[PDB]
Amino acid sequence: RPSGTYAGLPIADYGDAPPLSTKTMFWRTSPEKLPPGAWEPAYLGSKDERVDGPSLQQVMRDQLKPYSEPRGLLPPQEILDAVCDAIENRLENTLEPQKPWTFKKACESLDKNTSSGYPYHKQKSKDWTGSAFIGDLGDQATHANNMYEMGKSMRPIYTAALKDELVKPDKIYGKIKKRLLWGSDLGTMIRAARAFGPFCDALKETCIFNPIRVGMSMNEDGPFIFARHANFRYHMDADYTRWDSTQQRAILKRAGDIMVRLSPEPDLARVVMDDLLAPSLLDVGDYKIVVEEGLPSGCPCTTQLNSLAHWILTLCAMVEVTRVDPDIVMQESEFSFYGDDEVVSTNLELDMVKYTMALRRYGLLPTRADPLERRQTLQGISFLRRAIVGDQFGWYGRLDRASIDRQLLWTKGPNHQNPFETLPGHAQRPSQLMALLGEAAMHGEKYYRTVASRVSKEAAQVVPRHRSVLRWVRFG
Ligand SMILES: Cc1nc(/N=N/c2cc(S(=O)(=O)O)c3cc([N+](=O)[O-])cc(S(=O)(=O)O)c3c2)c(COP(=O)(O)O)c(C=O)c1O
Ligand SMILES: Cc1nc(/N=N/c2cc(S(=O)(=O)O)c3cc([N+](=O)[O-])cc(S(=O)(=O)O)c3c2)c(COP(=O)(O)O)c(C=O)c1O
């Protein structure tokens, strides 16, 4: 029955979503005071002692606004078609054909320590026997799977949440921001896993010679990835603001068509992709609202869809500007896409001003670093949280010290209301401490020493010498 607009978006029904969480999973590693400008867990609502801010619902409405903004322009249809053929073609020539996913495999693949979403909103593990969903979720899972096998449509219902994560302090103590998560319903997760699990698996296997890098290991795969990029003359590393909310469904639809066409049960996959990209029903608590545009997350094959969309858009811009055919562009370039993160290396003479304009024309908001700049060295180019570094031995991804120290101050634990509480006792995190030494080692012995000290100090409440970890971490 209900009508109107919530955060600029049409209301379609009453909502069933539980209330937004007021707790964080972050705990300080020490009771001492935080260094100034330190990152902290994002805002926790009216109950947050650190600051008096608006309601979580208001913070969520802020995040929903960009979804009602006008879309940018679709790329010129001929470029769009050639690019999409060229990307599909590239995948046909590289991906290993997969057998269908079983219902059993699909259910196994899901993360069992997160919510089931609409309508039970229970942690998946609570109806999971080890090998099958039973009880309530078993009924949802079974129904969804029957619909899948019958090629019948089902309207996903997403549940909005806000992301508990560390953030720069201005997002707590200034203008408060917190990231919108889209939380899928178990049924949609099942259908999506069955439909697209094969493609995603096939794609992960090619993460070194195909540009969708999802599933890569920074440590083991990065040096080969980065060495490939280095073979090309110009390097650029666009950063994008609000990638997800600025997507066009029409482009996501072209990405999806490629996924469907490269899946083992394409007729079944088609029904699922059409449900995923049909106007989206999102439960914000009081209301379920309809979101026609942007990317709907928590798919969970979304990161692939998104990366694929990114590949389409970047390539469309490049082709529009250089006028080189998309296949030849892939001969003369090396891409890395990981959702919204990009690295483009190319031999082509690319007009950076025109490239920036074409992306802005599509609705995207490219930004780096302080139009897009291109460099003749990969040194310093950013990828995920790393800086790409090269030396006599080769290339690697070095985590910035910011993130390193940040991991020294904060640890994960059970949800609580006050993030400045420390956990009692240990400090049960030896693996991370070592990895941190590793990450610190790549910064040189001077820095490694500092970090070694703190790591030792904390490990009190085997820490190797520098040259041995550095060797283990780069080569090992
Ligand atoms: C400090 C810390 N780091 C976490 N993971 N961060 C990731 C996590 C991943 S993940 O392998 O996709 O989970 C990262 C992956 C890539 N990658 O190029 O494939 C790169 C990076 S990055 O160091 O360059 O940013 C990745 C960083 C995580 C995520 O761990 P989890 O949810 O898998 O258990 C946690 C949470 O436990 C955490 O406390
Ligand atoms: C690039 C990349 N990074 C991921 N995790 N990022 C996190 C994620 C976390 S998390 O909030 O514990 O999930 C990080 C936590 C801390 N921390 O000091 O507690 C530090 C860091 S860091 O800035 O040093 O790298 C954390 C980094 C993740 C993990 O994201 P997700 O499991 O929450 O969905 C992925 C997922 O595939 C990913 O692809």
Side-chain angles (χ1 to χ4, degrees):
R1 210 180 306 90
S3 273
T5 62
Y6 188 106
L9 300 165
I11 286 170
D13 213 340
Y14 289 114
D16 290 304
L20 298 172
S21 181
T22 63
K23 285 176 169 171
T24 188
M25 69 190 172
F26 292 99
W27 294 70
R28 288 269 299 119
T29 42
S30 133
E32 296 308 324
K33 322 292 182 148
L34 230 42
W39 284 33
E40 300 180 30
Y43 176 60
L44 303 167
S46 57
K47 298 184 190 179
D48 201 336
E49 298 99 288
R50 292 166 303 161
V51 61
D52 290 333
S55 79
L56 295 167
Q57 288 292 155
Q58 193 203 112
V59 180
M60 185 165 57
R61 298 200 268 278
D62 292 0
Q63 297 295 132
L64 289 157
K65 272 292 184 185
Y67 286 92
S68 55
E69 301 270 49
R71 294 311 93 188
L73 304 168
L74 199 68
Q77 194 60 43
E78 281 142 22
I79 291 177
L80 183 52
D81 285 4
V83 167
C84 291
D85 294 350
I87 291 172
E88 187 172 348
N89 200 256
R90 163 99 180 202
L91 297 185
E92 281 177 17
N93 291 343
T94 50
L95 300 186
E96 194 67 33
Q98 304 287 303
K99 256 159 278 159
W101 267 29
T102 56
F103 175 64
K104 188 175 157 73
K105 178 68 163 173
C107 300
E108 279 167 353
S109 73
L110 275 32
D111 182 342
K112 301 298 180 326
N113 297 318
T114 60
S115 185
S116 74
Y118 180 91
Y120 303 108
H121 301 288
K122 66 170 100 173
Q123 179 148 112
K124 289 193 216 77
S125 62
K126 297 297 153 292
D127 277 336
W128 180 249
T129 65
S131 64
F133 281 111
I134 56 67
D136 287 338
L137 273 27
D139 285 346
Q140 188 178 12
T142 302
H143 167 64
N145 189 232
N146 284 335
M147 297 301 274
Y148 171 71
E149 287 183 0
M150 291 190 268
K152 292 212 174 157
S153 158
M154 280 178 87
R155 182 63 180 280
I157 298 158
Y158 297 96
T159 298
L162 304 167
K163 184 171 175 63
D164 180 25
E165 56 179 347
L166 298 176
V167 294
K168 72 200 192 186
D170 200 70
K171 298 170 169 210
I172 291 149
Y173 297 105
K175 174 54 172 167
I176 284 168
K177 299 175 162 185
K178 205 176 186 199
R179 297 204 292 166
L180 176 63
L181 293 173
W182 292 58
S184 206
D185 78 87
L186 182 61
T188 295
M189 297 172 173
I190 293 284
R191 300 197 284 140
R194 279 205 76 183
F196 305 116
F199 178 82
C200 290
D201 265 1
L203 205 56
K204 179 168 186 276
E205 281 157 27
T206 69
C207 67
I208 285 173
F209 40 96
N210 279 337
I212 295 168
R213 309 305 196 173
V214 168
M216 65 169 273
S217 145
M218 181 58 62
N219 210 272
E220 300 176 4
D221 300 326
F224 182 9
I225 290 164
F226 301 143
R228 296 157 66 89
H229 274 89
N231 293 335
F232 292 91
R233 188 162 173 184
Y234 307 107
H235 307 103
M236 78 204 180
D237 56 351
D239 215 83
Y240 289 91
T241 292
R242 294 197 282 280
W243 177 270
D244 284 11
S245 57
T246 62
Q247 295 309 118
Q248 300 176 43
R249 285 288 163 105
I251 291 287
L252 292 176
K253 285 171 179 283
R254 304 308 295 270
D257 295 346
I258 290 163
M259 297 187 58
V260 171
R261 221 135 48 206
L262 300 173
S263 289
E265 313 182 279
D267 293 317
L268 270 36
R270 171 39 75 209
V271 166
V272 186
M273 185 56 60
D274 291 343
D275 287 342
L276 287 170
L277 293 204
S280 302
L281 218 42
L282 175 65
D283 193 326
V284 300
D286 286 356
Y287 295 114
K288 300 187 182 76
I289 69 177
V290 177
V291 185
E292 282 166 51
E293 289 287 2
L295 173 82
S297 330
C299 173
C301 68
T302 182
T303 317
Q304 284 89 347
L305 186 62
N306 211 23
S307 293
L308 204 42
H310 197 332
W311 189 353
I312 293 167
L313 288 155
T314 290
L315 206 50
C316 278
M318 288 190 72
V319 168
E320 201 179 294
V321 169
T322 66
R323 311 287 332 263
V324 177
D325 145 278
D327 204 337
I328 315 310
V329 173
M330 293 195 285
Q331 279 177 228
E332 293 279 13
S333 308
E334 185 76 7
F335 303 130
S336 280
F337 305 112
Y338 197 129
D340 63 334
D341 190 80
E342 88 169 37
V343 179
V344 177
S345 299
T346 185
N347 287 333
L348 302 177
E349 291 300 336
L350 184 67
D351 185 338
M352 294 318 297
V353 174
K354 285 195 194 309
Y355 180 62
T356 308
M357 287 178 180
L359 300 167
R360 282 172 188 159
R361 197 151 53 244
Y362 307 155
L364 305 171
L365 298 179
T367 55
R368 278 226 70 70
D370 60 78
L372 285 170
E373 92 268 25
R374 89 188 172 184
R375 276 294 295 116
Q376 298 202 96
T377 191
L378 187 73
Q379 299 279 351
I381 267 62
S382 183
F383 184 61
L384 270 29
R385 294 182 179 80
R386 315 284 170 150
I388 295 169
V389 187
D391 61 23
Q392 52 269 7
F393 309 108
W395 300 93
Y396 63 101
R398 169 161 82 199
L399 187 67
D400 46 61
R401 306 138 176 263
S403 296
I404 292 178
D405 289 311
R406 202 169 315 127
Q407 284 180 54
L408 290 167
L409 305 159
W410 300 101
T411 188
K412 295 176 60 165
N415 275 345
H416 67 329
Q417 198 67 54
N418 176 20
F420 306 130
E421 303 177 48
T422 52
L423 286 163
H426 306 268
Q428 300 271 115
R429 57 173 208 167
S431 287
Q432 200 182 338
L433 268 33
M434 191 186 58
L436 252 7
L437 269 10
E439 297 300 345
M442 285 154 158
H443 282 284
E445 194 180 12
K446 181 265 175 67
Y447 185 79
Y448 173 76
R449 214 197 173 283
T450 310
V451 170
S453 164
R454 284 162 82 177
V455 167
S456 192
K457 184 189 211 284
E458 196 200 289
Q461 288 146 323
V462 50
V463 43
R465 60 202 306 283
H466 162 73
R467 202 64 209 71
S468 300
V469 59
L470 182 53
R471 187 210 66 242
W472 167 79
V473 81
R474 290 285 300 281
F475 321 113

PDB file of all heavy atoms in Angstrom, residues 213 215-218 338 383-386 399 407 412 432, ligand 1:
ATOM      1  N   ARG A 213      41.280  -9.048 -11.826  1.00  0.00           N
ATOM      2  CA  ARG A 213      42.300  -9.586 -10.945  1.00  0.00           C
ATOM      3  C   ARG A 213      41.732 -10.190  -9.675  1.00  0.00           C
ATOM      4  O   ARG A 213      42.482 -10.667  -8.847  1.00  0.00           O
ATOM      5  CB  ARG A 213      43.284  -8.494 -10.558  1.00  0.00           C
ATOM      6  CG  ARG A 213      43.851  -7.707 -11.720  1.00  0.00           C
ATOM      7  CD  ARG A 213      44.480  -8.632 -12.734  1.00  0.00           C
ATOM      8  NE  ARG A 213      45.337  -7.905 -13.641  1.00  0.00           N
ATOM      9  CZ  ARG A 213      46.124  -8.467 -14.548  1.00  0.00           C
ATOM     10  NH1 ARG A 213      46.171  -9.789 -14.714  1.00  0.00           N
ATOM     11  NH2 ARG A 213      46.878  -7.691 -15.306  1.00  0.00           N
ATOM     12  N   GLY A 215      40.664 -12.485  -6.923  1.00  0.00           N
ATOM     13  CA  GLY A 215      41.143 -13.831  -6.597  1.00  0.00           C
ATOM     14  C   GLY A 215      42.656 -13.942  -6.615  1.00  0.00           C
ATOM     15  O   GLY A 215      43.220 -14.986  -6.271  1.00  0.00           O
ATOM     16  N   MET A 216      43.326 -12.871  -7.013  1.00  0.00           N
ATOM     17  CA  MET A 216      44.782 -12.882  -7.056  1.00  0.00           C
ATOM     18  C   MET A 216      45.363 -12.878  -5.645  1.00  0.00           C
ATOM     19  O   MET A 216      44.701 -12.504  -4.687  1.00  0.00           O
ATOM     20  CB  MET A 216      45.308 -11.664  -7.811  1.00  0.00           C
ATOM     21  CG  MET A 216      45.002 -10.335  -7.134  1.00  0.00           C
ATOM     22  SD  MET A 216      45.916  -9.011  -7.917  1.00  0.00           S
ATOM     23  CE  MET A 216      47.434  -9.128  -6.979  1.00  0.00           C
ATOM     24  N   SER A 217      46.609 -13.307  -5.542  1.00  0.00           N
ATOM     25  CA  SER A 217      47.346 -13.200  -4.313  1.00  0.00           C
ATOM     26  C   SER A 217      48.380 -12.108  -4.547  1.00  0.00           C
ATOM     27  O   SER A 217      49.200 -12.209  -5.460  1.00  0.00           O
ATOM     28  CB  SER A 217      48.020 -14.538  -3.999  1.00  0.00           C
ATOM     29  OG  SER A 217      49.278 -14.357  -3.384  1.00  0.00           O
ATOM     30  N   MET A 218      48.353 -11.068  -3.727  1.00  0.00           N
ATOM     31  CA  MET A 218      49.257  -9.953  -3.947  1.00  0.00           C
ATOM     32  C   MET A 218      50.672 -10.465  -3.941  1.00  0.00           C
ATOM     33  O   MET A 218      51.470 -10.146  -4.820  1.00  0.00           O
ATOM     34  CB  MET A 218      49.095  -8.885  -2.871  1.00  0.00           C
ATOM     35  CG  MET A 218      50.005  -7.682  -3.065  1.00  0.00           C
ATOM     36  SD  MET A 218      49.733  -6.890  -4.656  1.00  0.00           S
ATOM     37  CE  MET A 218      48.032  -6.379  -4.477  1.00  0.00           C
ATOM     38  N   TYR A 338      39.791  -4.235 -10.458  1.00  0.00           N
ATOM     39  CA  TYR A 338      39.332  -4.946  -9.282  1.00  0.00           C
ATOM     40  C   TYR A 338      38.188  -4.126  -8.720  1.00  0.00           C
ATOM     41  O   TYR A 338      38.409  -3.189  -7.936  1.00  0.00           O
ATOM     42  CB  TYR A 338      40.495  -5.037  -8.305  1.00  0.00           C
ATOM     43  CG  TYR A 338      40.392  -6.058  -7.199  1.00  0.00           C
ATOM     44  CD1 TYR A 338      41.425  -6.946  -6.979  1.00  0.00           C
ATOM     45  CD2 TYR A 338      39.306  -6.088  -6.333  1.00  0.00           C
ATOM     46  CE1 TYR A 338      41.376  -7.863  -5.953  1.00  0.00           C
ATOM     47  CE2 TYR A 338      39.242  -7.002  -5.304  1.00  0.00           C
ATOM     48  CZ  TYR A 338      40.288  -7.888  -5.117  1.00  0.00           C
ATOM     49  OH  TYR A 338      40.263  -8.807  -4.095  1.00  0.00           O
ATOM     50  N   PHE A 383      47.772   0.348  -6.520  1.00  0.00           N
ATOM     51  CA  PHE A 383      46.852  -0.734  -6.816  1.00  0.00           C
ATOM     52  C   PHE A 383      46.382  -1.278  -5.489  1.00  0.00           C
ATOM     53  O   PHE A 383      47.199  -1.640  -4.664  1.00  0.00           O
ATOM     54  CB  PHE A 383      47.513  -1.853  -7.623  1.00  0.00           C
ATOM     55  CG  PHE A 383      46.554  -2.946  -8.026  1.00  0.00           C
ATOM     56  CD1 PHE A 383      45.455  -2.659  -8.833  1.00  0.00           C
ATOM     57  CD2 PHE A 383      46.722  -4.247  -7.585  1.00  0.00           C
ATOM     58  CE1 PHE A 383      44.550  -3.647  -9.192  1.00  0.00           C
ATOM     59  CE2 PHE A 383      45.833  -5.243  -7.948  1.00  0.00           C
ATOM     60  CZ  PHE A 383      44.750  -4.948  -8.751  1.00  0.00           C
ATOM     61  N   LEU A 384      45.062  -1.341  -5.299  1.00  0.00           N
ATOM     62  CA  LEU A 384      44.463  -1.675  -4.012  1.00  0.00           C
ATOM     63  C   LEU A 384      45.171  -0.826  -2.973  1.00  0.00           C
ATOM     64  O   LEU A 384      45.324   0.364  -3.202  1.00  0.00           O
ATOM     65  CB  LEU A 384      44.514  -3.182  -3.758  1.00  0.00           C
ATOM     66  CG  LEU A 384      43.289  -3.965  -4.269  1.00  0.00           C
ATOM     67  CD1 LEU A 384      42.611  -3.347  -5.474  1.00  0.00           C
ATOM     68  CD2 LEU A 384      43.661  -5.406  -4.555  1.00  0.00           C
ATOM     69  N   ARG A 385      45.633  -1.396  -1.866  1.00  0.00           N
ATOM     70  CA  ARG A 385      46.252  -0.576  -0.826  1.00  0.00           C
ATOM     71  C   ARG A 385      47.757  -0.451  -0.978  1.00  0.00           C
ATOM     72  O   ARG A 385      48.422   0.153  -0.143  1.00  0.00           O
ATOM     73  CB  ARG A 385      45.877  -1.107   0.549  1.00  0.00           C
ATOM     74  CG  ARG A 385      44.391  -0.934   0.787  1.00  0.00           C
ATOM     75  CD  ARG A 385      43.961  -1.408   2.159  1.00  0.00           C
ATOM     76  NE  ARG A 385      42.524  -1.187   2.328  1.00  0.00           N
ATOM     77  CZ  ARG A 385      41.559  -1.967   1.844  1.00  0.00           C
ATOM     78  NH1 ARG A 385      41.845  -3.066   1.156  1.00  0.00           N
ATOM     79  NH2 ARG A 385      40.287  -1.644   2.061  1.00  0.00           N
ATOM     80  N   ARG A 386      48.278  -0.974  -2.078  1.00  0.00           N
ATOM     81  CA  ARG A 386      49.704  -1.096  -2.263  1.00  0.00           C
ATOM     82  C   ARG A 386      50.204   0.007  -3.154  1.00  0.00           C
ATOM     83  O   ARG A 386      49.428   0.596  -3.916  1.00  0.00           O
ATOM     84  CB  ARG A 386      50.027  -2.401  -2.960  1.00  0.00           C
ATOM     85  CG  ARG A 386      49.288  -3.600  -2.414  1.00  0.00           C
ATOM     86  CD  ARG A 386      49.912  -4.003  -1.120  1.00  0.00           C
ATOM     87  NE  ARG A 386      49.152  -4.991  -0.383  1.00  0.00           N
ATOM     88  CZ  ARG A 386      49.715  -5.882   0.422  1.00  0.00           C
ATOM     89  NH1 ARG A 386      51.054  -5.933   0.545  1.00  0.00           N
ATOM     90  NH2 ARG A 386      48.942  -6.744   1.084  1.00  0.00           N
ATOM     91  N   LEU A 399      52.423  -2.432   0.980  1.00  0.00           N
ATOM     92  CA  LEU A 399      51.355  -1.840   1.738  1.00  0.00           C
ATOM     93  C   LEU A 399      51.905  -0.592   2.389  1.00  0.00           C
ATOM     94  O   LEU A 399      53.010  -0.626   2.938  1.00  0.00           O
ATOM     95  CB  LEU A 399      50.910  -2.822   2.813  1.00  0.00           C
ATOM     96  CG  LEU A 399      49.672  -2.428   3.594  1.00  0.00           C
ATOM     97  CD1 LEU A 399      48.448  -2.450   2.686  1.00  0.00           C
ATOM     98  CD2 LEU A 399      49.515  -3.370   4.772  1.00  0.00           C
ATOM     99  N   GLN A 407      46.832  -1.264  11.460  1.00  0.00           N
ATOM    100  CA  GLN A 407      46.669  -2.646  11.929  1.00  0.00           C
ATOM    101  C   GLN A 407      47.346  -2.925  13.271  1.00  0.00           C
ATOM    102  O   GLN A 407      47.023  -3.923  13.938  1.00  0.00           O
ATOM    103  CB  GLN A 407      47.220  -3.630  10.912  1.00  0.00           C
ATOM    104  CG  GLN A 407      46.330  -3.841   9.705  1.00  0.00           C
ATOM    105  CD  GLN A 407      46.949  -4.826   8.733  1.00  0.00           C
ATOM    106  OE1 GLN A 407      47.297  -5.946   9.104  1.00  0.00           O
ATOM    107  NE2 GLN A 407      47.112  -4.404   7.489  1.00  0.00           N
ATOM    108  N   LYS A 412      40.330  -7.109  15.390  1.00  0.00           N
ATOM    109  CA  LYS A 412      38.921  -7.473  15.315  1.00  0.00           C
ATOM    110  C   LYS A 412      38.558  -8.360  16.470  1.00  0.00           C
ATOM    111  O   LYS A 412      39.405  -9.012  17.064  1.00  0.00           O
ATOM    112  CB  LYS A 412      38.609  -8.177  14.002  1.00  0.00           C
ATOM    113  CG  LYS A 412      38.796  -7.299  12.781  1.00  0.00           C
ATOM    114  CD  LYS A 412      38.565  -8.076  11.492  1.00  0.00           C
ATOM    115  CE  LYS A 412      37.159  -8.654  11.395  1.00  0.00           C
ATOM    116  NZ  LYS A 412      36.759  -9.124  10.034  1.00  0.00           N
ATOM    117  N   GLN A 432      48.987 -12.542  11.810  1.00  0.00           N
ATOM    118  CA  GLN A 432      48.969 -11.145  11.395  1.00  0.00           C
ATOM    119  C   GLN A 432      50.263 -10.438  11.775  1.00  0.00           C
ATOM    120  O   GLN A 432      50.911  -9.843  10.921  1.00  0.00           O
ATOM    121  CB  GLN A 432      47.766 -10.422  12.003  1.00  0.00           C
ATOM    122  CG  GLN A 432      47.388  -9.141  11.276  1.00  0.00           C
ATOM    123  CD  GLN A 432      46.221  -8.421  11.915  1.00  0.00           C
ATOM    124  OE1 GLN A 432      45.430  -9.018  12.643  1.00  0.00           O
ATOM    125  NE2 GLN A 432      46.100  -7.122  11.634  1.00  0.00           N
TER     126      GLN A 432
HETATM  127  C1  LIG B   1      43.706  -6.148   8.625  1.00  0.00           C
HETATM  128  C2  LIG B   1      42.747  -6.889   7.939  1.00  0.00           C
HETATM  129  N1  LIG B   1      42.844  -7.027   6.603  1.00  0.00           N
HETATM  130  C3  LIG B   1      41.929  -7.722   5.896  1.00  0.00           C
HETATM  131  N2  LIG B   1      42.059  -7.891   4.582  1.00  0.00           N
HETATM  132  N3  LIG B   1      42.477  -7.021   3.846  1.00  0.00           N
HETATM  133  C4  LIG B   1      42.659  -7.431   2.592  1.00  0.00           C
HETATM  134  C5  LIG B   1      41.973  -8.557   2.120  1.00  0.00           C
HETATM  135  C6  LIG B   1      42.152  -9.022   0.824  1.00  0.00           C
HETATM  136  S1  LIG B   1      41.211 -10.477   0.289  1.00  0.00           S
HETATM  137  O1  LIG B   1      42.199 -11.576  -0.063  1.00  0.00           O
HETATM  138  O2  LIG B   1      40.374 -10.161  -0.950  1.00  0.00           O
HETATM  139  O3  LIG B   1      40.254 -10.938   1.386  1.00  0.00           O
HETATM  140  C7  LIG B   1      43.047  -8.356  -0.026  1.00  0.00           C
HETATM  141  C8  LIG B   1      43.238  -8.826  -1.327  1.00  0.00           C
HETATM  142  C9  LIG B   1      44.123  -8.204  -2.193  1.00  0.00           C
HETATM  143  N4  LIG B   1      44.280  -8.685  -3.445  1.00  0.00           N
HETATM  144  O4  LIG B   1      45.104  -7.999  -4.403  1.00  0.00           O
HETATM  145  O5  LIG B   1      43.604 -10.050  -3.910  1.00  0.00           O
HETATM  146  C10 LIG B   1      44.824  -7.080  -1.729  1.00  0.00           C
HETATM  147  C11 LIG B   1      44.649  -6.591  -0.431  1.00  0.00           C
HETATM  148  S2  LIG B   1      45.576  -5.128   0.071  1.00  0.00           S
HETATM  149  O6  LIG B   1      46.502  -5.436   1.253  1.00  0.00           O
HETATM  150  O7  LIG B   1      46.361  -4.567  -1.103  1.00  0.00           O
HETATM  151  O8  LIG B   1      44.597  -4.060   0.506  1.00  0.00           O
HETATM  152  C12 LIG B   1      43.751  -7.231   0.437  1.00  0.00           C
HETATM  153  C13 LIG B   1      43.559  -6.778   1.756  1.00  0.00           C
HETATM  154  C14 LIG B   1      40.854  -8.364   6.525  1.00  0.00           C
HETATM  155  C15 LIG B   1      39.898  -9.118   5.834  1.00  0.00           C
HETATM  156  O9  LIG B   1      39.973 -10.471   6.313  1.00  0.00           O
HETATM  157  P1  LIG B   1      38.752 -11.509   6.150  1.00  0.00           P
HETATM  158  O10 LIG B   1      37.403 -10.878   6.144  1.00  0.00           O
HETATM  159  O11 LIG B   1      39.106 -12.367   4.828  1.00  0.00           O
HETATM  160  O12 LIG B   1      38.900 -12.590   7.347  1.00  0.00           O
HETATM  161  C16 LIG B   1      40.731  -8.236   7.907  1.00  0.00           C
HETATM  162  C17 LIG B   1      39.684  -8.845   8.582  1.00  0.00           C
HETATM  163  O13 LIG B   1      39.885  -9.832   9.291  1.00  0.00           O
HETATM  164  C18 LIG B   1      41.683  -7.499   8.598  1.00  0.00           C
HETATM  165  O14 LIG B   1      41.554  -7.372   9.948  1.00  0.00           O
END
